[PDB]
Write a protein that binds this DNA or RNA. Sequence first.
DNA 1: CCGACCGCGCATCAGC
DNA 2: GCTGATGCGC
DNA 3: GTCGG
Length: 326
Amino acid sequence: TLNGGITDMLTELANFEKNVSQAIHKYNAYRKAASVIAKYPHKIKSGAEAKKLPGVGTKIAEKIDEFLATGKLRKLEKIRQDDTSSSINFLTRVSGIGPSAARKFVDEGIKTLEDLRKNEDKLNHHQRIGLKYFGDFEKRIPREEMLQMQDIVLNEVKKVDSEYIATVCGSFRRGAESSGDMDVLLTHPSFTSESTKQPKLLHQVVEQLQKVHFITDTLSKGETKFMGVCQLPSKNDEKEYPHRRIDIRLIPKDQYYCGVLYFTGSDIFNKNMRAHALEKGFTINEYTIRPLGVTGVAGEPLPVDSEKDIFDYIQWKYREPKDRSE
DNA sequence: CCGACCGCGCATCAGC
DNA sequence: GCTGATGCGC
DNA sequence: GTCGG
Ligand SMILES: Nc1nc2c(ncn2[C@H]2C[C@H](O)[C@@H](COP(=O)(O)CP(=O)(O)OP(=O)(O)O)O2)c(=O)[nH]1
Ligand SMILES: [Mg+2]
Ligand SMILES: [Mg+2]
Ligand code: NA
Ligand code: NA
């Protein structure tokens, strides 16, 4: 927050391009810029200064100029005085309502959290559940609740099968003192790049978590990815904890390190690490790192036995997860 | 300059 | 059913 | 929006 003014303004700009302009690459350009300036170790005093950075071009330089001069960006005050945009933007806050659906709703006159509640019939199940818990998902999860939620998830999967390994990734694993949600990586020795031995391996863990009333809703669920809602138990007279978004991702056990790396993030750290991997001749995903053929098609998976092994291929010294928040 | 811009799971729908 | 496209996510 | 072929 030494250049937080600058970075807030850029991310606000990015959220507008994605949610309103539906210009997803304008979104990313602003996000790279805000990430670079966040990692920049001096208070910025001029647009031309910040333009040396990669990701900052001439138009972001002029906005930084204006904001340093006025403590304000004109383009942003007009985006906040447009009802339409604030309506679109706010509807994207609902889990399940992207830019496309937000725009349709407001176009058909849904503009408020009241209007959505009177029109649940216009919403799929995912959206309905993001509305049902809209206020709780706007909240942050203190790290201390994360710790309780983790204890419950790891006890309960131990119960299903002692060979499951379960790892809380996302912002939690990067050391955050509060998280947006809980991200859980799951490995079992019978789910491996060689074959899906017993298949129900994720189902069985989702089902035990529902059984004990931890998982309360399902947004989506496939064979390797579960997207749902959970809640800590509360005692007999406390106000009860807000429901929370939980994500469980079942990776093949021989690809745990790539999977852990993807799932630990941050999202922007991942796009920059995957970009620099390309400029070293590899491609990384949650499963593998592979060298690239000059044909478009990637090579064979290279052996990995630690996160740092992946940094090494692309010639980067290790970054502890707490230095991956960008 | 005009294009390129990380990688992928799950749901839905279009065309078949 | 499917491929591939899109929408909304991680 | 920025950078690069
Ligand atoms: N490569 C890649 N990985 C991503 C992306 N988005 C998320 N991930 C990976 C990295 C990301 O860390 C992980 C979980 O994503 P979230 O839970 O949505 C965001 P978190 O970082 O946990 O912070 P929180 O808001 O929860 O406090 O999936 C993406 O666009 N690309
Ligand atoms: Mg998260
Ligand atoms: Mg998540
Ligand atoms: Na620059
Ligand atoms: Na959302």
